[PDB]
Design a protein around this ligand. Sequence first.
Ligand code: 8FP
Ligand code: CL
Ligand code: CL
Ligand code: CL
Ligand code: NA
Lengths: 99, 99
Amino acid sequence: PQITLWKRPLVTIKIGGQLKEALLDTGADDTVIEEMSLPGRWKPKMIGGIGGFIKVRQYDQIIIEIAGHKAIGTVLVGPTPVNIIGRNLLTQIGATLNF
Amino acid sequence: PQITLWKRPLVTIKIGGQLKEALLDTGADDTVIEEMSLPGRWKPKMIGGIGGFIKVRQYDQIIIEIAGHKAIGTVLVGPTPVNIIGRNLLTQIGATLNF
Ligand SMILES: COc1ccc(S(=O)(=O)N(CC(C)C)C[C@@H](O)[C@H](Cc2ccccc2)NC(=O)c2cccc(C(=O)N3CCC[C@@H]3c3nc(C)cs3)c2)cc1
Ligand SMILES: [Cl-]
Ligand SMILES: [Cl-]
Ligand SMILES: [Cl-]
Ligand code: NA
């Protein structure tokens, strides 16, 4: 699809068996989801943005379905105010910015 | 152009006669630039990023070139980890996300 930027680019994702709304975010290196449980191992990480840093859990090899397209990669889980799909998964669904 | 997302989507901007680097950021409603001098009056604004809220200075109707495209609109000045071009100016340069 071609997604307009007149509005926030929100899409439905499926992760861990759960449906969520998430922001397609070209400014995010990594994908960051609000607190939830995910299977398998994880390790702690700090990520920073406006306002400073938060601590997250890094899970590798997690499958997400993003607006109907499956992708696999690392997902960070922690107290983000918004679910963010970052470039590590946008690339896998072939997302580009066009102007 | 068509910009893939394997690398950060960094572009050159020109504001106040100065070239700077900035990140095209579909997850930001607003454009936020590091401390600099801009003309005119400013208004207060709070923005809530991943780590908390910051205060910024809001300047309206500022001339800014983005990747060679002319925009005139609101620029927020404050402590951001990188200069970010948000949707208020991505719409002015005609950007869309596509997959
Ligand atoms: C390493 O992986 C990382 C992943 C994400 C980040 S980040 O979330 O901090 N971020 C990085 C840039 C600052 C370099 C991504 C950026 O797109 C964030 C995404 C983000 C959206 C909403 C809340 C928290 C994070 N936006 C803003 O900072 C930002 C800047 C200026 C204005 C706004 C804005 O429009 N917001 C703030 C709250 C309300 C409104 C929005 N709500 C939503 C739902 C979308 S935008 C966001 C950092 C590291
Ligand atoms: Cl990854
Ligand atoms: Cl590609
Ligand atoms: Cl504007
Ligand atoms: Na894993």
